[PDB]
PDB file of C-alpha atoms in Angstrom:
ATOM      1  CA  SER T   5       0.132   0.227  -0.166  1.00  0.00           C
ATOM      2  CA  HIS T   6       2.660   2.494   1.009  1.00  0.00           C
ATOM      3  CA  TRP T   7       5.114   4.173  -1.718  1.00  0.00           C
ATOM      4  CA  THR T   8       8.078   3.381  -0.503  1.00  0.00           C
ATOM      5  CA  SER T   9       7.354  -0.463   0.643  1.00  0.00           C
ATOM      6  CA  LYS T  10       9.496  -2.116  -1.730  1.00  0.00           C
ATOM      7  CA  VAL T  11      12.201   0.167  -1.303  1.00  0.00           C
ATOM      8  CA  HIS T  12      15.582  -1.595  -1.367  1.00  0.00           C
ATOM      9  CA  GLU T  13      19.545  -0.854  -1.572  1.00  0.00           C
ATOM     10  CA  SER T  14      22.152  -2.279  -4.048  1.00  0.00           C
ATOM     11  CA  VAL T  15      25.529  -1.742  -2.761  1.00  0.00           C
ATOM     12  CA  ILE T  16      27.769  -1.391  -6.228  1.00  0.00           C
ATOM     13  CA  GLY T  17      31.214  -0.229  -7.613  1.00  0.00           C
ATOM     14  CA  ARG T  18      32.406   1.642 -10.223  1.00  0.00           C
ATOM     15  CA  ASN T  19      32.925  -0.989 -13.093  1.00  0.00           C
ATOM     16  CA  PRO T  20      36.882  -1.425 -14.818  1.00  0.00           C
ATOM     17  CA  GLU T  21      36.142   1.613 -16.916  1.00  0.00           C
ATOM     18  CA  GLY T  22      35.318   3.549 -13.437  1.00  0.00           C
ATOM     19  CA  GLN T  23      31.493   3.691 -14.272  1.00  0.00           C
ATOM     20  CA  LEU T  24      28.370   2.501 -12.934  1.00  0.00           C
ATOM     21  CA  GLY T  25      27.142  -0.182 -15.806  1.00  0.00           C
ATOM     22  CA  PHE T  26      23.743   1.589 -16.851  1.00  0.00           C
ATOM     23  CA  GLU T  27      22.797   5.315 -17.532  1.00  0.00           C
ATOM     24  CA  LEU T  28      21.534   7.923 -15.610  1.00  0.00           C
ATOM     25  CA  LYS T  29      17.355   9.256 -17.143  1.00  0.00           C
ATOM     26  CA  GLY T  30      15.176  11.222 -16.240  1.00  0.00           C
ATOM     27  CA  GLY T  31      16.112  14.319 -13.417  1.00  0.00           C
ATOM     28  CA  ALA T  32      13.952  17.263 -12.349  1.00  0.00           C
ATOM     29  CA  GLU T  33      14.617  18.991 -15.474  1.00  0.00           C
ATOM     30  CA  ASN T  34      12.327  16.083 -17.009  1.00  0.00           C
ATOM     31  CA  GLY T  35       9.761  16.030 -14.544  1.00  0.00           C
ATOM     32  CA  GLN T  36      11.179  13.073 -13.216  1.00  0.00           C
ATOM     33  CA  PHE T  37      13.067  11.442 -10.849  1.00  0.00           C
ATOM     34  CA  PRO T  38      16.303  10.159 -12.035  1.00  0.00           C
ATOM     35  CA  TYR T  39      15.847   6.408 -12.371  1.00  0.00           C
ATOM     36  CA  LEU T  40      18.013   3.600 -14.582  1.00  0.00           C
ATOM     37  CA  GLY T  41      17.755   3.134 -17.662  1.00  0.00           C
ATOM     38  CA  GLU T  42      18.781  -0.747 -19.223  1.00  0.00           C
ATOM     39  CA  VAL T  43      21.374  -1.939 -16.950  1.00  0.00           C
ATOM     40  CA  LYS T  44      23.018  -4.345 -18.826  1.00  0.00           C
ATOM     41  CA  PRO T  45      24.013  -7.718 -16.708  1.00  0.00           C
ATOM     42  CA  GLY T  46      27.541  -7.337 -16.250  1.00  0.00           C
ATOM     43  CA  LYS T  47      28.151  -4.245 -16.459  1.00  0.00           C
ATOM     44  CA  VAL T  48      27.487  -4.077 -12.976  1.00  0.00           C
ATOM     45  CA  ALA T  49      30.071  -4.508 -10.493  1.00  0.00           C
ATOM     46  CA  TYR T  50      27.975  -5.407  -7.715  1.00  0.00           C
ATOM     47  CA  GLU T  51      29.083  -5.933  -3.809  1.00  0.00           C
ATOM     48  CA  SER T  52      26.211  -6.802  -1.736  1.00  0.00           C
ATOM     49  CA  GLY T  53      22.623  -6.598  -0.683  1.00  0.00           C
ATOM     50  CA  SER T  54      19.868  -6.403  -3.407  1.00  0.00           C
ATOM     51  CA  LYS T  55      20.523  -6.652  -7.928  1.00  0.00           C
ATOM     52  CA  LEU T  56      19.370  -2.920  -9.797  1.00  0.00           C
ATOM     53  CA  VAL T  57      16.739  -4.112 -11.932  1.00  0.00           C
ATOM     54  CA  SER T  58      15.827  -1.327 -15.488  1.00  0.00           C
ATOM     55  CA  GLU T  59      13.979   1.701 -14.817  1.00  0.00           C
ATOM     56  CA  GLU T  60      13.962   1.450 -11.187  1.00  0.00           C
ATOM     57  CA  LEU T  61      14.187   5.380  -9.207  1.00  0.00           C
ATOM     58  CA  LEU T  62      17.426   6.345  -7.738  1.00  0.00           C
ATOM     59  CA  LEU T  63      16.376   8.078  -4.473  1.00  0.00           C
ATOM     60  CA  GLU T  64      19.847   7.903  -2.512  1.00  0.00           C
ATOM     61  CA  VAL T  65      23.431   7.491  -2.979  1.00  0.00           C
ATOM     62  CA  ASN T  66      25.474   6.415   0.040  1.00  0.00           C
ATOM     63  CA  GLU T  67      22.817   8.190   2.399  1.00  0.00           C
ATOM     64  CA  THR T  68      22.212  11.713   0.691  1.00  0.00           C
ATOM     65  CA  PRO T  69      18.559  11.706  -0.934  1.00  0.00           C
ATOM     66  CA  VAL T  70      19.050  12.728  -4.756  1.00  0.00           C
ATOM     67  CA  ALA T  71      15.357  12.570  -6.381  1.00  0.00           C
ATOM     68  CA  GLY T  72      14.146  15.715  -6.835  1.00  0.00           C
ATOM     69  CA  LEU T  73      17.527  16.776  -7.698  1.00  0.00           C
ATOM     70  CA  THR T  74      18.628  17.318 -11.896  1.00  0.00           C
ATOM     71  CA  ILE T  75      20.569  14.895 -13.477  1.00  0.00           C
ATOM     72  CA  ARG T  76      23.542  16.762 -13.006  1.00  0.00           C
ATOM     73  CA  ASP T  77      23.594  17.267  -8.960  1.00  0.00           C
ATOM     74  CA  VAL T  78      22.356  13.368  -8.836  1.00  0.00           C
ATOM     75  CA  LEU T  79      25.991  12.626 -11.046  1.00  0.00           C
ATOM     76  CA  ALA T  80      27.643  15.410  -8.834  1.00  0.00           C
ATOM     77  CA  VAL T  81      26.774  13.508  -5.344  1.00  0.00           C
ATOM     78  CA  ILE T  82      27.649  10.218  -7.390  1.00  0.00           C
ATOM     79  CA  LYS T  83      31.054  11.553  -7.556  1.00  0.00           C
ATOM     80  CA  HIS T  84      32.244  12.703  -4.161  1.00  0.00           C
ATOM     81  CA  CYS T  85      31.236   9.197  -2.920  1.00  0.00           C
ATOM     82  CA  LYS T  86      33.722   6.325  -3.000  1.00  0.00           C
ATOM     83  CA  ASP T  87      33.164   3.362  -3.637  1.00  0.00           C
ATOM     84  CA  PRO T  88      31.476   0.770  -2.859  1.00  0.00           C
ATOM     85  CA  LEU T  89      28.105   2.950  -3.160  1.00  0.00           C
ATOM     86  CA  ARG T  90      25.123   1.815  -1.402  1.00  0.00           C
ATOM     87  CA  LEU T  91      22.040   2.714  -3.599  1.00  0.00           C
ATOM     88  CA  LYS T  92      18.773   3.127  -2.453  1.00  0.00           C
ATOM     89  CA  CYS T  93      16.052   2.221  -5.148  1.00  0.00           C
ATOM     90  CA  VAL T  94      12.591   1.421  -5.896  1.00  0.00           C
ATOM     91  CA  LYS T  95      10.350  -0.187  -8.532  1.00  0.00           C
ATOM     92  CA  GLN T  96       7.728   1.916 -10.639  1.00  0.00           C
ATOM     93  CA  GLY T  97       4.546   0.296 -10.703  1.00  0.00           C
ATOM     94  CA  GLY T  98       1.225   0.939  -8.980  1.00  0.00           C
ATOM     95  CA  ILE T  99       1.928   3.542  -6.710  1.00  0.00           C
ATOM     96  CA  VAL T 100       5.351   4.567  -7.571  1.00  0.00           C
ATOM     97  CA  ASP T 101       6.184   6.731 -11.134  1.00  0.00           C
ATOM     98  CA  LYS T 102       9.059   8.259 -12.385  1.00  0.00           C
ATOM     99  CA  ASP T 103       6.860  11.324 -12.691  1.00  0.00           C
ATOM    100  CA  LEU T 104       7.411  14.223 -10.270  1.00  0.00           C
ATOM    101  CA  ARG T 105       4.303  16.720 -11.243  1.00  0.00           C
ATOM    102  CA  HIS T 106       2.399  13.533  -9.743  1.00  0.00           C
ATOM    103  CA  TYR T 107       4.699  12.370  -7.179  1.00  0.00           C
ATOM    104  CA  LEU T 108       4.235  16.048  -5.382  1.00  0.00           C
ATOM    105  CA  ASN T 109       0.395  15.801  -6.357  1.00  0.00           C
ATOM    106  CA  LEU T 110      -0.223  12.589  -3.820  1.00  0.00           C
ATOM    107  CA  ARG T 111      -1.865  13.275  -0.424  1.00  0.00           C
ATOM    108  CA  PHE T 112      -0.070  11.395   2.179  1.00  0.00           C
ATOM    109  CA  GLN T 113      -0.250  11.030   5.900  1.00  0.00           C
ATOM    110  CA  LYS T 114       1.629  13.580   7.998  1.00  0.00           C
ATOM    111  CA  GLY T 115       4.254  11.587   9.329  1.00  0.00           C
ATOM    112  CA  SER T 116       4.403   8.644   7.298  1.00  0.00           C
ATOM    113  CA  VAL T 117       7.344   7.593   5.322  1.00  0.00           C
ATOM    114  CA  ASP T 118       6.065   8.353   2.274  1.00  0.00           C
ATOM    115  CA  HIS T 119       5.517  11.836   3.914  1.00  0.00           C
ATOM    116  CA  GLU T 120       8.637  12.706   4.785  1.00  0.00           C
ATOM    117  CA  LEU T 121      10.060  11.176   1.555  1.00  0.00           C
ATOM    118  CA  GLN T 122       7.645  13.759  -0.318  1.00  0.00           C
ATOM    119  CA  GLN T 123       9.092  17.042   1.500  1.00  0.00           C
ATOM    120  CA  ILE T 124      12.795  15.700   0.509  1.00  0.00           C
ATOM    121  CA  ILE T 125      12.218  15.555  -3.050  1.00  0.00           C
ATOM    122  CA  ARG T 126      10.662  18.899  -2.654  1.00  0.00           C
ATOM    123  CA  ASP T 127      13.167  20.103  -0.336  1.00  0.00           C
ATOM    124  CA  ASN T 128      15.662  19.042  -3.355  1.00  0.00           C
ATOM    125  CA  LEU T 129      13.889  20.476  -6.068  1.00  0.00           C
ATOM    126  CA  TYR T 130      13.879  23.919  -3.971  1.00  0.00           C
ATOM    127  CA  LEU T 131      17.968  24.203  -4.345  1.00  0.00           C
ATOM    128  CA  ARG T 132      17.934  25.103  -7.911  1.00  0.00           C
ATOM    129  CA  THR T 133      14.154  26.241  -8.810  1.00  0.00           C
ATOM    130  CA  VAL T 134      12.801  29.674  -8.774  1.00  0.00           C
ATOM    131  CA  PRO T 135       9.273  30.132  -7.473  1.00  0.00           C
ATOM    132  CA  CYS T 136       6.828  31.737 -10.378  1.00  0.00           C
ATOM    133  CA  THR T 137       4.384  33.911  -9.518  1.00  0.00           C
ATOM    134  CA  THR T 138       1.648  36.300 -10.719  1.00  0.00           C
ATOM    135  CA  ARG T 139       1.587  38.318  -7.177  1.00  0.00           C
ATOM    136  CA  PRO T 140       3.060  41.687  -7.630  1.00  0.00           C
ATOM    137  CA  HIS T 141       6.974  42.464  -6.492  1.00  0.00           C
ATOM    138  CA  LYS T 142       7.067  43.550  -3.249  1.00  0.00           C
ATOM    139  CA  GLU T 143       9.596  46.070  -1.911  1.00  0.00           C
ATOM    140  CA  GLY T 144      13.194  43.788  -0.694  1.00  0.00           C
ATOM    141  CA  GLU T 145      12.650  40.850  -3.650  1.00  0.00           C
ATOM    142  CA  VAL T 146      15.047  40.142  -6.684  1.00  0.00           C
ATOM    143  CA  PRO T 147      13.302  39.408  -9.571  1.00  0.00           C
ATOM    144  CA  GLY T 148      15.007  36.015 -11.196  1.00  0.00           C
ATOM    145  CA  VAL T 149      15.599  35.240  -7.509  1.00  0.00           C
ATOM    146  CA  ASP T 150      13.467  34.854  -4.805  1.00  0.00           C
ATOM    147  CA  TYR T 151      10.806  34.723  -8.056  1.00  0.00           C
ATOM    148  CA  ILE T 152       9.645  34.706 -11.165  1.00  0.00           C
ATOM    149  CA  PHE T 153       7.107  37.543 -11.470  1.00  0.00           C
ATOM    150  CA  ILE T 154       4.966  36.706 -14.653  1.00  0.00           C
ATOM    151  CA  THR T 155       0.991  37.721 -15.532  1.00  0.00           C
ATOM    152  CA  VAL T 156      -1.747  35.519 -15.017  1.00  0.00           C
ATOM    153  CA  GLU T 157      -1.153  34.662 -18.869  1.00  0.00           C
ATOM    154  CA  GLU T 158       2.347  33.733 -18.478  1.00  0.00           C
ATOM    155  CA  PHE T 159       1.259  31.777 -16.137  1.00  0.00           C
ATOM    156  CA  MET T 160      -1.588  29.811 -17.974  1.00  0.00           C
ATOM    157  CA  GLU T 161       0.888  29.616 -20.394  1.00  0.00           C
ATOM    158  CA  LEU T 162       3.732  27.752 -18.273  1.00  0.00           C
ATOM    159  CA  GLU T 163       0.908  25.333 -16.906  1.00  0.00           C
ATOM    160  CA  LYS T 164      -0.848  24.349 -20.045  1.00  0.00           C
ATOM    161  CA  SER T 165       2.832  23.519 -21.207  1.00  0.00           C
ATOM    162  CA  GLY T 166       3.582  21.459 -18.369  1.00  0.00           C
ATOM    163  CA  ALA T 167       6.501  23.635 -17.432  1.00  0.00           C
ATOM    164  CA  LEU T 168       5.102  23.502 -13.953  1.00  0.00           C
ATOM    165  CA  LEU T 169       6.161  21.187 -11.455  1.00  0.00           C
ATOM    166  CA  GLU T 170       3.807  22.038  -8.702  1.00  0.00           C
ATOM    167  CA  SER T 171       1.192  25.058  -9.378  1.00  0.00           C
ATOM    168  CA  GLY T 172      -1.834  26.575  -6.714  1.00  0.00           C
ATOM    169  CA  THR T 173      -2.881  29.831  -5.314  1.00  0.00           C
ATOM    170  CA  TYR T 174      -2.414  31.981  -1.866  1.00  0.00           C
ATOM    171  CA  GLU T 175      -5.023  35.555  -2.006  1.00  0.00           C
ATOM    172  CA  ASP T 176      -6.357  35.251  -5.171  1.00  0.00           C
ATOM    173  CA  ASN T 177      -2.792  34.556  -7.189  1.00  0.00           C
ATOM    174  CA  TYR T 178      -0.912  32.242  -8.880  1.00  0.00           C
ATOM    175  CA  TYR T 179       2.145  30.311  -7.528  1.00  0.00           C
ATOM    176  CA  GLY T 180       4.153  27.605  -9.192  1.00  0.00           C
ATOM    177  CA  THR T 181       7.856  26.026  -9.478  1.00  0.00           C
ATOM    178  CA  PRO T 182       9.287  25.423 -12.949  1.00  0.00           C
ATOM    179  CA  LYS T 183      11.075  22.692 -14.030  1.00  0.00           C
ATOM    180  CA  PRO T 184      14.890  23.596 -13.808  1.00  0.00           C
ATOM    181  CA  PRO T 185      16.475  23.581 -17.050  1.00  0.00           C
ATOM    182  CA  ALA T 186      19.774  21.539 -18.288  1.00  0.00           C
ATOM    183  CA  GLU T 187      23.230  23.833 -17.881  1.00  0.00           C
TER     184      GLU T 187
ATOM    185  CA  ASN F   1      16.427  28.297  -2.206  1.00  0.00           C
ATOM    186  CA  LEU F   2      13.964  28.267   0.622  1.00  0.00           C
ATOM    187  CA  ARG F   3       9.999  29.069  -0.033  1.00  0.00           C
ATOM    188  CA  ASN F   4       8.001  31.067   1.601  1.00  0.00           C
ATOM    189  CA  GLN F   5       4.969  31.204   3.708  1.00  0.00           C
ATOM    190  CA  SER F   6       2.568  32.202   0.862  1.00  0.00           C
ATOM    191  CA  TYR F   7       3.864  30.079  -1.168  1.00  0.00           C
ATOM    192  CA  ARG F   8       3.617  27.023   0.254  1.00  0.00           C
ATOM    193  CA  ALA F   9       0.227  27.979   1.521  1.00  0.00           C
ATOM    194  CA  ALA F  10      -0.524  28.138  -1.851  1.00  0.00           C
ATOM    195  CA  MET F  11       0.593  24.281  -2.270  1.00  0.00           C
TER     196      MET F  11
END
């Protein structure tokens, strides 16, 4: 019943070419979890724990939560971890999906493992995203930093384009978080 | 960076 019920740990090492043996896909820049591509059997240097399977969602690297980050950030975390690499993953299916916007829509019970992971994934997405809003600029705010200040029409285009990972209203104004860029 | 109270309410 729980989103995190099938989370497992796979301990791997770098293959003889220094790589992981699988490509990382998704990332917040596609509105997605980081998740694994095709796991070629024999390209992963397994160490302990459980095996990796294709298209599982990558949650943590050496106990650093990475879901909600770009692929840039995820690989940057990987690069600063010495072997062995402890990966926490979950297979997609049922309630578990790589789509970040839909995962942020889910209503979990406050205090649940599911809820705590959702807030962790929000903070990560917030690290490199600047929110957008239709309210007017207030004194002291830096456009492009505290907010992107856009009109209602522009906010509706971003929403209709699927650019927003999260949307809401407060005192008759629009707030949202756009997908981060690849830079 | 971190979101204000207003943004957090809007969600």
